[PDB]
Paper text:
The exosome and its related bacterial polynucleotide phosphorylase (PNPase) represent a class of conserved multi-subunit protein complexes responsible for the 3′-to-5′ processing and degradation of RNA. Architecturally, the ∼250 KDa prototypic archaeal exosome is similar to the bacterial PNPase, consisting of a catalytic ring containing a trimer of Rrp41/Rrp42 heterodimers, and with a trimetric Rrp4 or Csl4 RNA-binding ring stacked on the top. Both Rrp41 and Rrp42 are homologous to RNase PH, but only Rrp41 possesses the phosphorolytic 3′-to-5′ exoribonuclease activity. A large “processing chamber” was found inside the catalytic ring, where three identical phosphorolytic active sites reside.
To further understand the RNA recruitment mechanism of the exosome family of macromolecular machines, we determined the crystal structure of the archaeal Sulfolobus solfataricus exosome. We observed that while the catalytic ring of the S. solfataricus exosome adopts a three-fold symmetric structure, its RNA-binding ring displays considerable rigid body and thermal motions, which broke its internal symmetry. The three copies of Rrp41/Rrp42 heterodimers within the catalytic ring align extremely well with their counterparts in the previous structure, even though the three-fold NCS was not enforced in our structure, the three heterodimers does not deviate notably from their symmetric positions. In addition to rigid body shifts, we observed conformational heterogeneity among Rrp4 subunits. While two of the three copies (Chain C and I) overlap reasonably well with their counterparts in the previous structure, with the r.m.s.d of the Cα alignment at 0.5 Å and 0.6 Å, respectively, and at 0.8 Å with each other, the third Rrp4 copy (Chain F) adopts a significantly different conformation (the r.m.s.d. of 250 Cα alignment is 1.5 Å with the previously published structure). The conformational changes are not due to changes in the crystal packing environment, as minimal crystal contacts were observed around the Rrp4 ring. The exceptionally large geometric deviation in Chain F is due to a rigid body hinge motion at the linker region between the N-terminal domain and the S1/KH domains, because when aligned separately, each domain agrees well with their counterparts in other two Rrp4 subunits (r.m.s.d. of Cα alignments for the N-ter, S1, and KH domains are at 0.3 Å (50 aa), 0.3 Å (70 aa), and 0.7 Å (115 aa), respectively, Fig. 3b–d). The hinge motion causes the S1 and KH domains in chain F to move away from the central channel and thus increases the diameter of the pore opening. Although Chain C and Chain I of Rrp4 adopt very similar conformations, Chain I displays considerably higher thermal motion than Chain C, manifested by a higher average temperature factor of 81 versus 61, as well as wider thermal ellipsoids in Chain I.
Author numbering:
A (entry chain I): 8 to 55, 58 to 114, 119 to 197, 205 to 226
B (entry chain D): 1 to 172, 183 to 271
C (entry chain E): 2 to 238
D (entry chain H): 5 to 238
E (entry chain G): 1 to 270
F (entry chain A): 1 to 92, 103 to 172, 183 to 271
G (entry chain B): 7 to 238
H (entry chain C): 7 to 228
Write the structure that this text describes.
């Protein structure tokens, strides 16, 4: 049993550690027999080892997550929502209302929506719920798209960044798991700078 | 057959509601004015095996044009000219939704519009490409490859086209092409009740229509093409050519600077 | 193009077919010529002839090709092999693929497609005799056929190709003018709404020549538009 | 007329020793509207790849219930060759697109995205032998530049035979006028071969000698790939 | 398109298992060992209107190749040589998922692999093939039509390809135009060429893989040999990968079989 | 590939049974007899830029055919005759278009109605090529007959150049199609009749009433007697059709 | 060329009412629900059937009957001059003519919303290919147990030097006066395929009509027994 | 009128069986036009009492009749169930709620109960003209298959492999090596121990297919 690196930059195929660890399943680690390999351009780490992806422009759905989506199509029984995933999400018309449809043609093609993934696995596309607090149709400000990878980075590290982006410009910017923040001048920019300068520490600044 | 496009590019409402409020103050989302062209980059001799090439970056639109010369027969149609063949392609690599195979309709239109603005402008004199009349002649193959669809691809296509032709060295090395003068194409988009110069992807997804005006250095109109589902007023066309021509002065100069005049 | 002539404007200000610089060719319209077509028309401009057929709003064959909020227009521009001087290959050329798109988009702003979501409206045109202005003759036949099919529209589309021959601004170009002239500027519009539907230029013009030809087309279009309204009118009651 | 491929000292027409690689240039993230992108240069051979990350398959009956579908394309621009090449996909381009796809099929962890599609498109801007490998490596790096999980990067070289002399990374003169041309690509850290072709002739022994020469040429490119992706800002 | 094949017919999650333990014991389900080819048969002159033809039955794989000679221009890309054109078609007839039209991808690959192995071995030369230089030349059309897809189609294609070229009767050019009555003589053939495919299934190497074995294999590698046991073509196929030792040993197992195969081929044609 | 046509448009079971009852008294819905053709019209020189053209209106079937003449080289296979090429196009090549083109070509070529050997300018060198493009503008049923009437008419309308004169035409050729509907034989079947028929058979005649082309079409089948009788009815009609054709061509 | 030599015999030594030699072989392909090989002298055809299966695009299918998908294709080495493998205008015609022949025999009503695929290759051509192809198809469908009203037997009757003849050879097709392919369901006496190419008098038409029917009944027995070599 | 033309013959499509009127129910293998009776398939003409029929000698496709018991193959895992191949012209569908006995929970099927590649024993709960076959895995011994070998046969010899009064069942269920479950599908599921004297029994179910016409068969099997 031996680990090979402290916390360097790691590439796909790069050997991490070998032997008997366990070690839950990560999409960023592949293990054949005893050897452990990174599967992504990422950052090696440990605690109690792991790879934090440094690259990745898609979002991978987890049940319970809060995402800001974009309505692509309206169906007869609901709405098709884009959530930056390999799969398109579906918001049932029932969930939005009070539970049924008097067959009528309501948000439309291009409306942003904050919602929670209520259901998702390997045989289904993500199903959205608009039930909770602040969940609903976004009707203002701007939606800033970022790599779903930099989601935790735009915040800190003890919520540090969140107060710094807000104490220079505008208001309640919402960092969704989705890699999309809803803003309410411009910030695109500094979230385009913490966006690209993320590799370099200690965070910040200005 | 020739059908209304199915899918599609969905621009957000709020990213359209706010784009118009920016127009109201005469500024666009990237910061430029309603009349400003996007930043222009021209890298001559990018494709090293081409007789002449240009890599044009216009905003986020990337276009590469290369030339290939050969000796063929002049057609039954006047044997006192060379040949010009324009082939434009949108590669399945330039945009997410794009698919492989033959040119598509937009691809054919882009090729045809660039062909006309080169041929009719007398920008490239074909009569001088004759080696011996009714016998052997130079054939100019111009292949335009769009590598990143960032909007206003017609204007970037023309810039690369002219640039590639000026970078072309003829062999058996003898000299450049019998080129009279550079030609530029300026696209003006009717967005809402505004006329906007060199539209980007978001602007192209919200516009009613666009009209493209091609100019020679003497500021002579040498090609017009209207595109899009929507219609324009007579006053929109009249004003769009005014806006287009004023920009043609600026654009011909930055083009020359890049083409070594 | 040769490099000095043949003569286009002749020896008194009259053209190679006998027209003044501001005269239209002869026009003949005929409606509902095809019985197994929802709408049909034949259009003739001098020596240019086109027939159009329409198949009213119907269901789309493959689902994902249809649109959720509007009808899909399926427009075709084709030339018969015997419509030209030299036998033309009946396989669609690059010219025909371009014109089909340009004609479709022209009609996209006239046809009230929002009325029939998830449907397809098919519009097929054949050029039976080509003598310049075909794209416009074809588009007008399409407009008339659609009217002959009772499919709602904002307005009819009337169009002409204004141009330049020997430094002279001319209306409605013939084949000799298209081939040997300096400019060929097809314009079509919705005359009642003063909205331009199709706009192309091939050749060369000055900013001022552009606006003079632009004016000549508009009054040429208004005459064609009158002939269209009255062609559909005969059904006198 | 066939040129002499090996002087006369053991050097090649371009000036390399039997075991030397051409100049390698790598550039990541060159396209803006593409989930991943890369440029790969091997001497005079230049290629550009774009990836469009996992997404929904257009027709439902062309997708797979348990894994993503790879859509890989090899295409040569008309001005990449010396004589203009017809842009319509030739028989050579159709063969290589399949061979490049299958090479990626063992590296790209497709099990993670059932019912989806991963699109990879390559363009050859300049050709000079090795194009299929340069294409494949640009593709591999572009997929990494997109953050799509992979078993290991793919590095490749064409090993061959010139004047009875076993050589590494053939040039245009050598592919055209040599005895053998053997493109080999693998996942070097897992010691698994991903692409393996031979065009020409070799003895069983010359086969195993070139085999070895390729493996060490591969390991060099492998580190150029790794570090090119690793030019973080550390 | 070049997409992952969206059809597997689905091999049962349990069928794979039984074929793996029938292995180990080092045997197969058609009773042969891991290094055995299936029963072979070659019928010369099967298609009477071809200049030369062969019907190859390799196991349940059935392939038919015919030749057709024509006088053409050469290219001004080198012109003291004739032509070889290979067209392989996996016919709708051979397997349930095959549909008709242009050659597919597997078709094109099979054609190009066979073409390289015939052209590069110099087995067909050429030789020769000029009737008068830079002016007139023989053009050999070789059309290989797979009639039944039973696995290891590549090797069956090569056997039929070589056998059909050996069956080819040439005719008289007499000034100009061809004839018939005066059959001049055989094709300019230096020697026969064979292809051996070894499939990596689970942890085993398997020679001449059938349909069931091809459906569960990781990958297969194909080795082309001349009679002097010189390697003249290699092609790897499949979604999966092999180790360096797998390939190293795959070529050993292929070469030992090339001796057995070249002699059975020779009996079938002289 | 070649598949059973999917788009069907469906025929009412009650409509067919009313069409059958009209057959039972020897009349049809358009009022004509079981042996009558639909009203025929032929407009020569309709497409002006063609060498020779014919706009045929037969019932609600409209067909336009134009000719184009060029100087090409005769094929290796017999260089002592000109060329005829027939391209049919249904305008709503498909399968039906290819069939129609091929059946029109055979009955024109085999009948020796248009002598190709006389189209030679100089043997083995330059020869006249006749392009025949037939364009079905309105599919109103029995399109094959309307295709042949248009083809022949356009050939007779064709003027050759150096203007010299007509083609080496021996005689006109007509084609008569007889549909088996229910238990009846119907001449010149229209759209509704084609939609309810088992099958149709087409007979081409030169002025002898000599058979110079036969083609059967459709999902269903006919008996031996049905065919025997269909040709007998077809031939009697050929006499009537040739004389209306000649009237149109100016003999 | 002389076709009916002055003695009452043909170029190949046959009488005016005689058939060329025939060889039929069932179940030749393993991956094919039904198959057959048909020889008619110098004409060789092979057919494969893939039993009722699902249609790939939903809207190309029929709610009440199976769709037949038939193909006629000639190999590039089946002719005297190399034939382009891309489907010719001839092959597209004959594919339809053979499909429509089989539409009246195959009981399509039993398998609504499905597709039945029938593929045929001509390995050797010498006139009669379209009928040999159709007969190979019929038998292949039977070798698959797809219910059919009756087998389809067919010959090309014809005319040479004024002499009405049965089962044309290549010389007869390309130099004779007439060529009349006829195929039918002999037990139901229903004509399934009928074409004429060339020229015949109304009387000659009816004479050759009768000659074909007796030539048909001979091949029909050869078909029934060929499927009966099960063992009976 | 009422004459039978054949004793017990091998029959081909389009072959005359009988003249005049009999009181036979509709069968896919016999077509009656007016008063004549014809075979539609290559089969076996059998006469019993007043009736006669054709046992088909060929047929590699299975045709669904309600409440049959088939062994199928999972091709696709749908959101609310599974798609299954049962050798029919139509692909079958096994509802998820049928298998679980309850509606699917919020985060279930990776595959788990059945995956792409799994064998299934199920009965056709519902099928007809407007619908594709719907399945049920409820009865005894239905559900997923977890060992042995599955032998595919022509679905048309299914009755023959079981034999008269289920007797070819136990003559093969007892020289071996069973339970041999002959599904109506043309697929039998064998469960031999067994390594490796083997149930190449498989070749015995092959010899049945080669000679269903030869009698008495149930004794030629040895």
């Amino acid at each position: 049993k031996i680990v090979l690196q402290p916390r360097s930059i790691v590439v796909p195929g790069e050997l991490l550690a070998e032997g008997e660890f366990q070690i839950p399943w990560s999409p960023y680690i592949l293990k054949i027999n005893s050897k452990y390999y990174s599967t992504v351009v990422g950052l090696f780490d440990v605690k109690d080892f792991e790879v934090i992806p440094l690259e990745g422009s898609f979002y991978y759905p987890k049940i319970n997550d809060i995402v800001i989506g974009l309505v692509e199509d309206v169906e007869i029984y609901g709405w098709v929502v884009d959530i930056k995933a390999p799969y398109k999400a579906y918001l049932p018309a029932s969930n939005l209302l009070g539970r049924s449809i008097n067959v009528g043609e309501y948000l439309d093609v291009g409306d942003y929506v904050i919602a929670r993934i209520e259901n998702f696995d390997r045989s289904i596309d993500p199903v959205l719920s608009v039930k909770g607090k602040d969940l609903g149709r976004v009707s203002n400000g701007i939606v800033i798209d970022i790599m779903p990878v930099k989601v935790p980075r735009v915040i800190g590290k003890n919520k540090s960044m969140y107060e710094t982006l807000t104490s220079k410009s505008g208001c309640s910017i919402f960092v969704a798991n989705n890699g999309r923040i809803w803003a309410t001048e411009i910030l695109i920019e500094a979230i385009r700078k913490i966006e690209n300068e993320s590799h370099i520490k200690g965070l910040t600044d200005r | 057959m020739s059908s209304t496009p199915s899918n599609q590019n969905i621009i957000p409402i709020i990213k359209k509601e706010s784009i118009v409020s920016l127009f109201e103050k005469g500024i666009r989302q990237d910061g430029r004015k309603l009349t400003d062209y996007r930043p222009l980059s021209i890298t001559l001799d990018y494709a090293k095996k081409a007789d002449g090439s240009a890599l044009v970056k216009l905003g986020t639109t990337m276009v590469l044009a290369g030339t290939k010369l050969e000796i063929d027969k002049p057609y039954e149609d006047t044997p006192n000219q060379g040949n010009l063949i324009v082939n434009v392609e949108l590669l399945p690599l330039a945009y997410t939704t794009f698919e492989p195979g033959p040119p598509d309709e937009n691809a054919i239109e882009l090729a045809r519009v660039v062909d006309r603005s080169l041929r009719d402008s007398k920008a490239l004199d074909l009569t001088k490409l004759v080696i011996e009349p009714g016998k052997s002649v130079w054939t100019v193959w111009l292949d335009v490859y769009v590598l990143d669809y960032g909007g206003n691809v017609l204007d970037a296509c023309t810039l690369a086209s002219v640039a590639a032709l000026y970078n072309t060295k003829v062999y058996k090395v003898v000299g450049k092409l019998p080129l009279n003068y550079p030609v530029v194409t300026i696209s003006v988009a009717k967005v809402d009740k505004y006329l906007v110069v060199d539209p980007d992807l978001d602007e192209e997804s919200i516009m009613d229509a666009k009209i493209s005006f091609s100019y020679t250095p003497d500021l002579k109109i040498v090609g017009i093409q209207k595109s899009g589902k929507g219609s324009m007023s007579l006053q929109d066309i009249d004003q769009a050519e005014n806006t287009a021509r004023s920009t043609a002065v600026k654009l011909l100069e930055e083009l020359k600077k890049h083409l070594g005049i | 193009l040769q490099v000095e002539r043949p003569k286009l404007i002749l020896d008194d200000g009259k053209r190679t077919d006998g027209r003044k610089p501001d005269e239209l060719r002869s026009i003949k319209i005929e409606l509902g010529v095809l019985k197994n077509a929802d709408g049909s028309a034949i259009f003739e401009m001098g020596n240019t002839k086109a027939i159009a057929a329409v198949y009213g709003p119907k269901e789309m064959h493959p689902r994902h090709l249809s649109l959720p909020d509007r009808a899909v227009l399926r427009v075709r521009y084709h030339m018969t092999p015997f419509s030209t001087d030299e036998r033309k290959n009946p396989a669609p050329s690059r010219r025909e693929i371009e014109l089909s798109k340009v004609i479709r988009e022209a009609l996209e702003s006239a046809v009230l497609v929002e009325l029939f979501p998830r449907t397809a409206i098919d519009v097929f045109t054949e050029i039976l005799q080509a003598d310049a202005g075909s794209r416009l003759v074809s588009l007008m036949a399409a407009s008339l056929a659609l009217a002959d099919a009772g499919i709602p529209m904002r307005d009819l589309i009337a169009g002409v190709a204004v141009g330049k021959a020997d430094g002279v601004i001319i209306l409605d170009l013939n084949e000799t003018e298209d081939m040997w002239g300096e400019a060929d500027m097809p314009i079509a519009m919705m005359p009642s709404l003063n909205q331009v539907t199709l706009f192309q230029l091939n050749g060369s013009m000055t900013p001022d020549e552009f606006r003079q030809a632009f004016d000549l087309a508009v009054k040429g279009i208004n005459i064609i538009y009158n002939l269209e309204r009255e062609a559909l009118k005969s059904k006198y009651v």
